[PDB]
Design a protein around this ligand. Structure first.
Ligand code: MET
Length: 520
């Protein structure tokens, strides 16, 4: 089924400025998007801001400014941040957008007509900071700004308040069996696996119905009104999750401005999401509520939700560290260092260690070696002579790599894709050391042709598979290698030997480097 590969980030609350959390989530989205574009597929990558709800309105009131002004400014800060970070996101959505509001109204109305929304009551705990309803088992004792004894969330540690409101309720309980069917028929639909297991356990235990509206006073009137009932506002999460549906229906001009909302998602071939990227902190909303809504509405379900080990929401400024160590370098570090855990060492020490050892010593070294005038005297891709068994072992690794990296990218597990490429880069480095092409220039020119050609091709293929991770440096590497544009994307070019011998290398600069090593 040919469609537009649809990949999303969460949309971020605008109560506060962009920080590393949002940059990381959106980086993952961006990397996935880029990989599928290099694969030759149509892609639509989505990110944006979550602008309604009690939390934002209280932040605005804290800053003594109107919610309208406040959201607009902070959304601008997010856009500027993602421009600075050099992403390639196709559209930036804001929930204040009038077309999004229309979509929310359609979806709400569909649920209501399907009999899945009734007027009832929520009486229980609520974390305003997480916009999350919580049962008594998810709360405990803690403290607030005052230092008074209060109740806090077990999920997040944020302060919880007791709510008692007549609310529109969504019949979430009715979807338990179907959600379980969905998880089991699609055992790759939630990644990583242990988070899939978490979701299943929770749903097995039982599902309550879910408040999908709140009284307008409670939200300081900063939300989407319920269709046919102005006293109630749409829950910030039903609002928020719907952004994915809205995005899938917006025609977008060359400047990234939304120009038109289509009636039928099928017109644009995006919905549903192939990959929803999220932090672990919002798994339940994406793996339980969201698909229940879609099931109620007769809409297709997303293929994959991937939940990373960070929270979606001692200073760590990504722009600052990118200006210090390089943008691609920082992106590589964030994607290499962290698995599906809030673990890994993000210190300057380890950043420099990975920069120096992996980027400079392994990749950069090898790029310079095979393009050096001392070794590559003719400044071109040589025609190989006959291959030894050792040559063939390296070639085999290079040939196998695209299929290996492809599976990892599709899981998705970007850390493993990176590790796989670098395993091949280490192997190529070892080969070069064993063959000592610098000695071969004088000794055996025929042998050098073979060695040089394999090395070049190894660098090309590894770099191609690293191009989603290192988008700018990949271009520099291809320029040095003289790889024509046409050979820089497309699955045809994953294949060993796509760049013919005789291809000239790009020009040299006197003292250039690819990655500058840094002091220890
Ligand atoms: C539909 S994704 C919403 C994510 C939420 N606004 C957050 O920042 O955690």
């Amino acid at each position: 089924v040919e469609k537009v590969f649809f990949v999303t980030s969460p949309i971020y609350y605008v109560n506060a400025a962009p920080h590393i959390g949002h940059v990381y989530s959106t980086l993952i989205t961006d990397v996935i998007g880029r990989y599928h574009r290099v694969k030759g597929e149509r892609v639509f990558a989505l990110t944006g801001t979550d602008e309604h709800g009690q939390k934002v309105a209280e932040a605005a009131k804290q800053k003594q400014v109107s919610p309208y002004d406040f959201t607009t400014a902070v959304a601008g800060e997010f856009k500027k941040c993602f421009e600075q970070m050099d992403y390639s996101i196709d559209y930036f959505i804001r929930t204040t957008n009038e077309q999004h509001k229309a979509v929310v109204k359609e979806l709400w109305t569909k649920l209501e007509q399907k009999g899945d929304i009734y007027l009832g009551r929520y009486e229980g705990w609520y974390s305003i900071s997480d916009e999350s309803f919580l049962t008594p088992q998810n709360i405990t004792d803690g403290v607030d700004k005052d230092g008074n004894p209060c109740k806090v969330s077990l999920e997040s540690g944020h302060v919880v308040t007791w709510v008692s409101e007549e609310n529109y309720m969504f019949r979430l309980s009715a979807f338990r069996e179907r959600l379980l069917e969905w998880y089991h028929a699609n055992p790759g639909c939630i990644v990583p696996e242990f988070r899939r297991r978490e979701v299943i356990r929770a749903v097995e235990k039982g599902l309550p119905d879910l408040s999908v509206s709140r009284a307008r006073a409670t939200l300081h009137n900063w939300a989407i009104p319920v269709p046919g009932n102005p006293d109630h506002c749409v829950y910030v999460w039903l609002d928020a999750l719907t952004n994915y549906l809205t995005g899938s229906r917006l025609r977008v001009d060359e400047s990234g401005k939304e120009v038109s909302l289509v009636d039928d998602f099928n017109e644009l071939e995006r919905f549903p999401a192939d990959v929803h990227v999220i932090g672990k902190d919002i798994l339940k909303f994406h793996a339980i509520y969201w698909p229940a809504f879609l099931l109620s509405a007769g809409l297709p379900l997303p293929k994959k939700i991937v939940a990373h080990g960070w929270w979606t929401k001692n200073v760590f400024d990504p722009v600052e560290k990118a200006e210090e160590f390089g943008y691609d370098a920082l992106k590589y570090f964030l994607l290499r260092e962290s698995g599906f855990s809030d673990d890994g060492d993000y210190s300057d020490k380890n950043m420099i260690a990975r920069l120096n050892g992996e980027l400079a010593d392994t990749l950069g070294n090898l790029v310079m070696r095979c393009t050096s005038a001392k070794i590559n005297v003719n400044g071109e891709w040589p025609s190989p002579a006959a291959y030894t068994e050792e040559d063939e072992s390296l070639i085999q690794l290079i040939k196998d790599l695209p299929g290996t990296a492809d599976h990892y990218y599709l899981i998705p597990d970007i850390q493993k894709a990176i590790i796989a490429v670098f395993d091949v880069l280490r192997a190529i480095n070892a080969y070069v050391t064993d063959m000592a092409p610098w000695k071969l220039v004088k000794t055996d020119p025929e042998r050098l042709r073979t060695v040089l050609y394999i090395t070049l091709e190894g660098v090309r293929v590894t770099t191609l598979l690293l191009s989603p991770i290192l988008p700018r440096k990949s271009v520099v590497i291809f320029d040095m290698l003289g790889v024509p544009e046409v050979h820089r994307k497309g699955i045809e070019n994953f294949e060993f030997g796509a760049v013919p011998p005789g291809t000239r290398l790009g020009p040299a600069v006197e003292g250039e480097v690819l990655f500058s090593k840094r002091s220890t």
